[PDB]
Amino acid sequence: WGSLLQDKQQLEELARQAVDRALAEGVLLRTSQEPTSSEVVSYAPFTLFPSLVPSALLEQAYAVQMDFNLLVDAVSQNAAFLEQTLSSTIKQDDFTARLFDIHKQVLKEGIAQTVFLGLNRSDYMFQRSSPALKQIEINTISASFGGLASRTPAVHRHVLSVLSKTKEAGKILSNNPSKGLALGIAKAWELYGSPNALVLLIAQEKERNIFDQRAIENELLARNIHVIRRTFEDISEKGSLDQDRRLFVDGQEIAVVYFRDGEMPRQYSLQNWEARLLLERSHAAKCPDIATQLAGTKKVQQELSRPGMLEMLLPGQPEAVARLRATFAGLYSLDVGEEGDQAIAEALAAPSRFVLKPQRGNNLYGEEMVQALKQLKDSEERASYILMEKIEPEPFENCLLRPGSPARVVQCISELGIFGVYVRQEKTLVMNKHVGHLLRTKAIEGVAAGVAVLDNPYPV
Amino acid sequence: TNWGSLLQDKQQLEELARQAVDRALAEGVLLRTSQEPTSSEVVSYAPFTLFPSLVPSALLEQAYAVQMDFNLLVDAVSQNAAFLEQTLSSTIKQDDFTARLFDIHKQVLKEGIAQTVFLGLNRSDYMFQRSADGSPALKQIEINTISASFGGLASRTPAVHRHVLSVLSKTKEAGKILSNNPSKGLALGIAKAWELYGSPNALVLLIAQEKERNIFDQRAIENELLARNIHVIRRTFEDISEKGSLDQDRRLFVDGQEIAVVYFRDGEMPRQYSLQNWEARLLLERSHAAKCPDIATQLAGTKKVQQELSRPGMLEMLLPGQPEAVARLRATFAGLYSLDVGEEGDQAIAEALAAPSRFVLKPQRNNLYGEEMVQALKQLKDSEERASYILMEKIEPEPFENCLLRPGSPARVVQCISELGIFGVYVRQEKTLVMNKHVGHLLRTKAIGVAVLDNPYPV
């Protein structure tokens, strides 16, 4: 479809068509100027065209989501695994220490909730081996863009239709993760067993991605389930527990706490840490619970790759273990010791093969990674980082539409996300599924730079 | 209302307003800002009401029931050269805008009309007058025969009002909001004209200025056409001057592509035309393409034609043997008065000078009330420019309370009045009427500032 654009004039004309359709379809962010206000909005950056994705790789990513849901839930329930895995990390990293301290406090007091759920997103890249599916990470707190991802297929159908490619417009895959994500919260709300109780959505006041979050709220409203949006500071001021640890905000009972904040250390303060502890101690279901946020950390991801580790967490499930392990790339501990020393030495000698990732645009490549490794080698801070195999997908051409940037065709690579939803009542899994996908695409330079834009996986 | 009376403090109102605005944005109820009217990189919501305003079912039904009569009336006017010439003979001597529209109309009649396909997308607007008995009566403000607006955004607002009522657990009331999709019906009129034109590869040409806040409303019509494999190009009058060309059969080409339908979303006001833009308007009118509207149909929507249509026996002359249609049309007419030279115009001027509260002064080309109207009438009485104005009965609906949401303005409950619009679509091949229908409604509400989008809640 690229060949049909004669020059920059035709490209800019098609880009204008795409942008106006994206806005009409609700593919929206607040402005960076006014992240607290909907009095002006922009479009969420997205690709002019849907990017080609081999059907086998998309199928493989879908086929392992229920395994990842079981694995994260198994990790969240294994106090010894979490403590052994994170012991060195919590000594160095204040953020992980504070999350772990809340986990320890609620384990000590006893878990108040009987309803557990996860809304997550497992992210992959296509490694040049033929392409192979390899996991970047799994996002177990504030799994984003399921709302906007439900709105972009119509935009790509519009762009292909403008070019009279109506057969190709029809091959774009329908995608509605926001319905599935909402249905996970709705199931947890039903199991909590208070018809008048609310869903509490924790979000900071500065939230450019509010429309993505409102999509989940709109789906719950359609099912007569009401959401209140509150900050951690609002919970510090107004939240409290009754004698049975039921959570009340503004006199209203809370059934489900849905986090869309609390993933990064700068989002906290003393009062916000106090609020996170109050929420975790409550009888409300948490999405995620504190142990499940810990299950999504880089150090857990690295330790899950150790020989025999998956078998220990998922006993007697060889097919599930095989599907999970197939997605694992090289993951290396940088902890003090000979093994961490070898990984540092390998990355100093061949920096193009590795990425340095803090326990958390913070990843380091090339010369910046080499400078950081020289500083980390004789620092106990080395426990707060992992090294990973650099995944280099085959670049391809697309046009990344972002406000303030002229429409230009550039070399790109993608990240494929699968949205997972599971719900457990006590020890019993009642829901475990995939609910849709997210393709995001970034310009290369080879290191991906700029923020990833929304895309759709065109099946080939 | 059951919903309105739950909002007792400013914090409650502001919280519900935030819910409304976020849902409106998600539903594509969008408008460019006044300061960035050429760019879609930063936009906002089209102003709208927090709640749907109460509208008597009988008045909505009456407005729908007269639309097909208005479509016949405007089409009949457009085809009656003698009626247009007699009606506007004094107007064209004084008003440059009417003179230039009329001159194109005359040049095309003299050359011969090239198109064989005709259509109108229009919007007939009403207010609810307090009648003698105290019961409201439906009275026409005007009919918009060029660039009939907001049928795209009106297709998107019902979901917003359902959301607001659902937040308040008023799900029965959310269910009673009327479904409304004028965007689809308006596009289907263009699609019918495109089918009758008979060129599978011909385009719809949408004429629009580069400075266009209401682009999203316009795109809704384009989206509906694209769903039916009909393609739109947006061009300015300046683009048509540069690139528009006719073949020996007066087929219109832009960038080598044939044009089946010219859909005007510009050209309703004099300030939109340079001399080059008037040349472009003539080129388009001379072409074989269907025009929405044709120049005669734009003239059919003007204030002077509106007033002359109220003369005794005039409807009967334009719509012979149609007594039930004539009665439905005439029922909606308020007082409309010529200000042309002569005793009658003198009588209207004297009545308004003496009792200004009863009247509004309206230009043919900016409506004047009270003291401002009196000063203007003193200046117009001994001026030939009186031919460029009509006097109209002042319609004062019963005020009611609602909350008008506008970007950058605080949420406030204020006294309001509404205008109810009905969208009309008709398509004709030569003498054969192929489509004639209503396709939806538009309720707009204003503080007693800008009219905001609303929905008529049936009572």
Side-chain angles (χ1 to χ4, degrees), chain A residues 1-5 7-460, chain B:
Chain A
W1 32 75
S3 299
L4 291 182
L5 296 172
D7 48 28
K8 277 141 195 189
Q9 158 189 48
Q10 294 300 319
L11 174 62
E12 286 170 1
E13 187 285 320
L14 194 60
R16 275 193 311 266
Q17 297 188 283
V19 161
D20 287 350
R21 187 65 186 251
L23 290 169
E25 294 296 335
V27 179
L28 299 184
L29 297 174
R30 287 175 169 170
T31 68
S32 63
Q33 287 74 30
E34 296 289 353
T36 74
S37 176
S38 298
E39 296 293 92
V40 274
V41 299
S42 193
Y43 60 95
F46 68 93
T47 58
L48 180 54
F49 301 110
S51 297
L52 303 192
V53 171
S55 289
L57 291 170
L58 182 60
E59 288 169 353
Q60 184 187 346
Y62 269 113
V64 71
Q65 185 61 41
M66 284 174 63
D67 308 317
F68 273 112
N69 291 347
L70 287 176
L71 180 57
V72 167
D73 198 34
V75 164
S76 80
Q77 290 174 265
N78 193 320
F81 174 80
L82 284 173
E83 184 165 308
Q84 292 171 35
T85 298
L86 295 175
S87 51
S88 69
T89 303
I90 65 156
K91 286 181 175 62
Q92 301 303 318
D93 183 45
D94 183 76
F95 185 56
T96 310
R98 286 185 205 288
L99 295 174
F100 196 79
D101 188 58
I102 293 179
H103 161 66
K104 270 194 88 191
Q105 285 192 240
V106 167
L107 270 185
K108 191 164 92 268
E109 181 174 14
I111 306 303
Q113 69 265 29
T114 57
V115 177
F116 306 83
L117 74 159
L119 273 53
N120 63 43
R121 199 186 68 221
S122 188
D123 290 338
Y124 309 93
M125 288 189 179
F126 310 143
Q127 182 161 48
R128 305 186 226 98
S129 63
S130 72
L133 191 76
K134 296 296 176 180
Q135 182 182 54
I136 302 314
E137 65 182 330
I138 185 160
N139 305 101
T140 62
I141 182 159
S142 204
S144 59
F145 294 109
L148 302 193
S150 307
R151 292 174 188 180
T152 60
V155 179
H156 285 146
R157 295 189 208 281
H158 180 113
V159 170
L160 287 187
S161 295
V162 164
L163 297 176
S164 295
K165 300 297 192 207
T166 56
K167 179 178 77 175
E168 297 78 5
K171 286 200 266 150
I172 292 158
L173 300 173
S174 60
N175 193 42
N176 193 11
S178 34
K179 184 172 173 190
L181 293 169
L183 283 172
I185 294 168
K187 186 59 174 189
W189 177 93
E190 290 171 4
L191 295 176
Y192 178 83
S194 290
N196 304 134
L198 304 185
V199 171
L200 172 64
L201 188 163
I202 302 294
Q204 61 175 309
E205 279 199 329
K206 295 180 196 312
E207 181 50 83
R208 292 187 71 203
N209 203 25
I210 188 159
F211 304 103
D212 186 59
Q213 297 175 9
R214 287 290 200 191
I216 305 310
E217 305 179 32
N218 292 347
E219 293 282 344
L220 287 170
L221 188 56
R223 291 160 182 92
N224 311 121
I225 299 170
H226 291 85
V227 170
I228 54 163
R229 299 175 57 81
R230 298 289 184 273
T231 64
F232 285 116
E233 291 86 353
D234 293 335
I235 301 309
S236 286
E237 187 193 8
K238 282 315 210 167
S240 66
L241 306 190
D242 78 359
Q243 67 179 16
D244 297 326
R245 282 158 82 202
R246 294 175 185 278
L247 174 62
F248 288 86
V249 180
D250 303 325
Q252 311 261 348
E253 191 187 7
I254 306 305
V256 184
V257 182
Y258 177 40
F259 290 102
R260 297 297 294 259
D261 192 30
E263 65 268 14
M264 294 296 287
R266 76 183 160 287
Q267 295 160 353
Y268 294 85
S269 60
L270 176 58
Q271 70 175 313
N272 294 358
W273 281 118
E274 289 177 341
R276 182 71 193 271
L277 175 63
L278 190 67
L279 294 168
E280 286 302 324
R281 289 179 56 238
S282 77
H283 183 52
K286 274 68 64 167
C287 185
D289 61 49
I290 188 71
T292 300
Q293 176 170 3
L294 292 170
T297 63
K298 304 287 153 167
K299 181 62 181 186
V300 167
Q301 190 187 352
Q302 174 268 130
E303 272 300 300
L304 282 171
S305 76
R306 291 292 199 189
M309 195 65 88
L310 286 182
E311 290 87 353
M312 189 163 89
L313 281 162
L314 296 178
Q317 300 158 258
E319 298 301 314
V321 164
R323 285 187 298 266
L324 290 162
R325 185 165 284 137
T327 76
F328 292 179
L331 289 149
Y332 311 102
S333 176
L334 296 173
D335 289 354
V336 297
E338 186 189 70
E339 187 184 30
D341 288 356
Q342 287 166 351
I344 290 170
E346 290 300 350
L348 288 166
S352 74
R353 296 221 153 76
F354 298 98
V355 56
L356 176 67
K357 298 202 179 182
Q359 165 82 353
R360 276 188 266 190
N362 302 128
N363 295 159
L364 303 182
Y365 304 78
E367 160 78 316
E368 195 167 354
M369 177 177 70
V370 166
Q371 302 183 276
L373 289 171
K374 287 170 172 181
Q375 285 198 254
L376 281 169
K377 176 184 182 174
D378 306 303
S379 175
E380 21 251 76
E381 300 150 70
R382 54 193 273 181
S384 304
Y385 290 83
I386 67 162
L387 194 79
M388 194 164 171
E389 187 186 353
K390 194 178 166 199
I391 308 297
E392 289 189 324
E394 180 153 10
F396 64 89
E397 292 185 319
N398 206 331
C399 173
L400 312 185
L401 300 179
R402 186 166 267 119
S405 293
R408 293 169 183 174
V409 171
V410 297
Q411 294 248 280
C412 297
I413 62 170
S414 302
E415 192 161 35
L416 174 69
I418 304 296
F419 291 98
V421 174
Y422 63 92
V423 181
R424 167 166 55 82
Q425 186 166 34
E426 294 179 81
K427 294 172 189 79
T428 305
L429 199 64
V430 297
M431 183 180 278
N432 183 14
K433 58 202 298 183
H434 50 74
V435 298
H437 50 77
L438 177 66
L439 192 68
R440 286 192 294 169
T441 296
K442 286 186 292 190
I444 43 152
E445 304 148 346
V447 177
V451 190
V453 311
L454 298 175
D455 204 336
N456 279 291
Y458 193 88
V460 300
Chain B
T1 54
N2 284 331
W3 52 81
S5 52
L6 278 167
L7 296 189
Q8 287 174 315
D9 84 348
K10 216 166 107 298
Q11 315 308 73
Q12 285 177 322
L13 181 68
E14 286 180 356
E15 168 54 27
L16 195 60
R18 279 192 305 266
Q19 308 292 282
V21 160
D22 284 355
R23 189 59 186 256
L25 289 164
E27 292 300 331
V29 180
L30 298 177
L31 193 69
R32 291 179 170 163
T33 70
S34 65
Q35 307 100 320
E36 302 190 10
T38 76
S39 177
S40 295
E41 293 193 342
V42 182
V43 305
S44 194
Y45 54 94
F48 69 98
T49 57
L50 180 54
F51 295 119
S53 298
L54 306 189
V55 173
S57 58
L59 292 177
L60 184 60
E61 287 162 0
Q62 180 188 353
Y64 269 111
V66 70
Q67 185 63 44
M68 281 170 67
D69 309 320
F70 273 113
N71 292 345
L72 290 173
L73 181 60
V74 161
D75 197 35
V77 167
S78 78
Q79 293 174 262
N80 192 321
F83 173 77
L84 283 173
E85 179 161 296
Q86 291 165 11
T87 300
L88 301 170
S89 59
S90 286
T91 324
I92 66 166
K93 292 182 187 80
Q94 302 304 321
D95 184 49
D96 182 78
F97 183 62
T98 302
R100 291 195 189 271
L101 295 172
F102 190 81
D103 174 57
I104 290 176
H105 158 69
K106 279 317 212 199
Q107 287 188 49
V108 167
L109 279 190
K110 178 176 189 189
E111 183 178 19
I113 294 173
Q115 69 266 28
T116 54
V117 178
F118 304 84
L119 74 157
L121 272 53
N122 63 42
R123 198 188 71 217
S124 190
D125 287 339
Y126 310 90
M127 287 182 174
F128 307 144
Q129 184 175 46
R130 293 177 256 196
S131 76
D133 188 45
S135 60
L138 190 77
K139 292 301 172 173
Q140 185 180 48
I141 304 314
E142 66 178 339
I143 184 164
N144 307 101
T145 59
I146 181 161
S147 197
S149 60
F150 289 110
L153 302 192
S155 302
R156 298 175 183 176
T157 59
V160 175
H161 285 150
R162 298 191 205 277
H163 180 110
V164 170
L165 285 180
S166 295
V167 164
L168 295 177
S169 293
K170 301 224 173 276
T171 58
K172 194 174 100 189
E173 296 93 340
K176 288 184 65 166
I177 292 163
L178 298 180
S179 62
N180 192 44
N181 194 6
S183 188
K184 178 182 171 191
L186 291 169
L188 280 169
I190 294 169
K192 186 62 166 189
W194 178 91
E195 289 174 351
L196 292 171
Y197 183 88
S199 290
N201 292 323
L203 306 180
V204 173
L205 175 60
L206 187 163
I207 302 297
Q209 289 179 310
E210 296 183 4
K211 296 173 87 194
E212 185 47 75
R213 291 185 68 193
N214 200 26
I215 192 158
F216 305 105
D217 189 58
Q218 296 174 11
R219 291 286 201 190
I221 308 309
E222 302 182 37
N223 294 345
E224 292 283 348
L225 285 169
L226 187 62
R228 295 167 165 285
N229 307 129
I230 301 168
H231 291 90
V232 172
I233 55 165
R234 301 170 59 81
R235 296 293 186 271
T236 66
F237 285 115
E238 293 87 351
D239 292 336
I240 299 311
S241 288
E242 189 181 28
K243 297 301 182 209
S245 43
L246 304 186
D247 77 1
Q248 70 185 299
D249 297 337
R250 287 155 71 199
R251 293 177 184 272
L252 171 63
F253 295 78
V254 180
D255 299 318
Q257 303 210 60
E258 190 183 9
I259 307 305
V261 183
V262 180
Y263 175 44
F264 289 100
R265 296 296 299 252
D266 192 31
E268 68 269 10
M269 302 180 99
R271 56 178 185 240
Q272 299 167 345
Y273 296 80
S274 57
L275 297 177
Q276 62 166 318
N277 291 357
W278 282 114
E279 296 175 343
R281 184 71 193 271
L282 173 60
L283 188 67
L284 295 171
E285 289 294 326
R286 288 178 60 239
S287 81
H288 180 59
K291 274 68 60 162
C292 184
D294 60 53
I295 189 76
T297 300
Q298 182 173 0
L299 288 170
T302 65
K303 297 277 176 272
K304 182 65 184 173
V305 167
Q306 187 181 2
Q307 173 267 128
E308 266 303 300
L309 283 172
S310 71
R311 292 291 195 186
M314 197 66 87
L315 289 177
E316 289 89 345
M317 192 163 75
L318 284 160
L319 295 182
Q322 292 150 262
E324 297 192 345
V326 164
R328 283 191 296 271
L329 290 160
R330 184 166 284 136
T332 73
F333 291 179
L336 289 151
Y337 310 105
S338 185
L339 293 169
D340 288 6
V341 172
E343 173 196 82
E344 187 179 24
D346 294 357
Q347 277 179 349
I349 291 167
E351 287 302 343
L353 284 170
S357 73
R358 305 214 297 102
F359 300 99
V360 180
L361 177 61
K362 297 202 177 173
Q364 171 74 357
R365 143 182 307 169
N366 277 288
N367 294 339
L368 297 169
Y369 297 84
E371 315 98 300
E372 284 181 28
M373 174 177 73
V374 169
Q375 298 163 342
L377 287 175
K378 290 179 179 168
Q379 276 178 239
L380 284 179
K381 58 178 200 297
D382 290 314
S383 170
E384 296 291 339
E385 299 180 20
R386 53 197 279 174
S388 304
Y389 290 83
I390 66 166
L391 198 72
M392 193 171 167
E393 181 179 5
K394 191 181 206 156
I395 306 297
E396 292 183 353
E398 289 218 298
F400 64 90
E401 296 251 64
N402 205 335
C403 173
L404 312 182
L405 302 178
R406 176 174 162 79
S409 293
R412 274 153 26 108
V413 174
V414 301
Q415 295 201 2
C416 299
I417 58 171
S418 306
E419 278 198 4
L420 174 66
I422 306 298
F423 291 102
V425 174
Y426 63 93
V427 182
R428 168 163 62 75
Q429 190 176 54
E430 295 285 68
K431 294 179 181 77
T432 306
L433 191 63
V434 163
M435 177 179 285
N436 186 10
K437 63 202 301 168
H438 51 73
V439 298
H441 48 80
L442 175 69
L443 190 69
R444 284 174 299 110
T445 297
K446 66 179 182 185
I448 207 135
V450 205
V452 314
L453 298 170
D454 200 345
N455 280 293
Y457 189 89
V459 301

PDB file of all heavy atoms in Angstrom, chain A residues 238 247-253:
ATOM      1  N   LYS A 238      -9.284   9.873  53.095  1.00  0.00           N
ATOM      2  CA  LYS A 238     -10.729   9.527  53.114  1.00  0.00           C
ATOM      3  C   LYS A 238     -10.955   8.017  53.273  1.00  0.00           C
ATOM      4  O   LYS A 238     -12.066   7.644  53.648  1.00  0.00           O
ATOM      5  CB  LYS A 238     -11.405  10.011  51.827  1.00  0.00           C
ATOM      6  CG  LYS A 238     -11.712  11.502  51.767  1.00  0.00           C
ATOM      7  CD  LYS A 238     -12.328  12.037  53.044  1.00  0.00           C
ATOM      8  CE  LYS A 238     -13.270  13.204  52.842  1.00  0.00           C
ATOM      9  NZ  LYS A 238     -14.060  13.465  54.072  1.00  0.00           N
ATOM     10  N   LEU A 247     -13.261  -1.988  53.134  1.00  0.00           N
ATOM     11  CA  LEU A 247     -12.720  -0.678  52.709  1.00  0.00           C
ATOM     12  C   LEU A 247     -13.880   0.252  52.379  1.00  0.00           C
ATOM     13  O   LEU A 247     -14.713  -0.125  51.547  1.00  0.00           O
ATOM     14  CB  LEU A 247     -11.819  -0.861  51.486  1.00  0.00           C
ATOM     15  CG  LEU A 247     -11.306   0.427  50.839  1.00  0.00           C
ATOM     16  CD1 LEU A 247     -10.444   1.214  51.816  1.00  0.00           C
ATOM     17  CD2 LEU A 247     -10.516   0.115  49.585  1.00  0.00           C
ATOM     18  N   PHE A 248     -13.868   1.446  52.954  1.00  0.00           N
ATOM     19  CA  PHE A 248     -14.886   2.487  52.682  1.00  0.00           C
ATOM     20  C   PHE A 248     -14.198   3.762  52.213  1.00  0.00           C
ATOM     21  O   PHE A 248     -13.243   4.222  52.846  1.00  0.00           O
ATOM     22  CB  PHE A 248     -15.751   2.741  53.913  1.00  0.00           C
ATOM     23  CG  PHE A 248     -16.679   1.582  54.164  1.00  0.00           C
ATOM     24  CD1 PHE A 248     -16.249   0.492  54.894  1.00  0.00           C
ATOM     25  CD2 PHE A 248     -17.953   1.578  53.628  1.00  0.00           C
ATOM     26  CE1 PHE A 248     -17.085  -0.595  55.093  1.00  0.00           C
ATOM     27  CE2 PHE A 248     -18.786   0.489  53.824  1.00  0.00           C
ATOM     28  CZ  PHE A 248     -18.350  -0.584  54.561  1.00  0.00           C
ATOM     29  N   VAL A 249     -14.695   4.311  51.115  1.00  0.00           N
ATOM     30  CA  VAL A 249     -14.240   5.642  50.634  1.00  0.00           C
ATOM     31  C   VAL A 249     -15.478   6.514  50.442  1.00  0.00           C
ATOM     32  O   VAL A 249     -16.384   6.105  49.701  1.00  0.00           O
ATOM     33  CB  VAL A 249     -13.411   5.498  49.348  1.00  0.00           C
ATOM     34  CG1 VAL A 249     -12.946   6.852  48.860  1.00  0.00           C
ATOM     35  CG2 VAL A 249     -12.225   4.558  49.549  1.00  0.00           C
ATOM     36  N   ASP A 250     -15.528   7.667  51.104  1.00  0.00           N
ATOM     37  CA  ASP A 250     -16.702   8.573  51.012  1.00  0.00           C
ATOM     38  C   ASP A 250     -17.967   7.799  51.422  1.00  0.00           C
ATOM     39  O   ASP A 250     -19.012   8.023  50.793  1.00  0.00           O
ATOM     40  CB  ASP A 250     -16.828   9.144  49.591  1.00  0.00           C
ATOM     41  CG  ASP A 250     -15.597   9.894  49.111  1.00  0.00           C
ATOM     42  OD1 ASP A 250     -14.951  10.550  49.948  1.00  0.00           O
ATOM     43  OD2 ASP A 250     -15.265   9.790  47.909  1.00  0.00           O
ATOM     44  N   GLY A 251     -17.851   6.892  52.402  1.00  0.00           N
ATOM     45  CA  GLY A 251     -18.959   6.095  52.971  1.00  0.00           C
ATOM     46  C   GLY A 251     -19.383   4.923  52.087  1.00  0.00           C
ATOM     47  O   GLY A 251     -20.332   4.207  52.488  1.00  0.00           O
ATOM     48  N   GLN A 252     -18.725   4.716  50.937  1.00  0.00           N
ATOM     49  CA  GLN A 252     -19.086   3.685  49.922  1.00  0.00           C
ATOM     50  C   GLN A 252     -18.178   2.455  50.084  1.00  0.00           C
ATOM     51  O   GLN A 252     -16.963   2.623  50.176  1.00  0.00           O
ATOM     52  CB  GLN A 252     -18.898   4.236  48.507  1.00  0.00           C
ATOM     53  CG  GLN A 252     -19.533   5.602  48.284  1.00  0.00           C
ATOM     54  CD  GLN A 252     -20.879   5.549  47.604  1.00  0.00           C
ATOM     55  OE1 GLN A 252     -21.300   4.523  47.075  1.00  0.00           O
ATOM     56  NE2 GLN A 252     -21.558   6.681  47.593  1.00  0.00           N
ATOM     57  N   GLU A 253     -18.739   1.250  50.077  1.00  0.00           N
ATOM     58  CA  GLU A 253     -17.909   0.030  50.200  1.00  0.00           C
ATOM     59  C   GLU A 253     -17.194  -0.211  48.866  1.00  0.00           C
ATOM     60  O   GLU A 253     -17.794  -0.031  47.782  1.00  0.00           O
ATOM     61  CB  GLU A 253     -18.734  -1.185  50.605  1.00  0.00           C
ATOM     62  CG  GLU A 253     -17.887  -2.378  50.997  1.00  0.00           C
ATOM     63  CD  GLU A 253     -18.653  -3.657  51.242  1.00  0.00           C
ATOM     64  OE1 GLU A 253     -19.859  -3.672  50.972  1.00  0.00           O
ATOM     65  OE2 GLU A 253     -18.035  -4.623  51.708  1.00  0.00           O
TER      66      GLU A 253
END
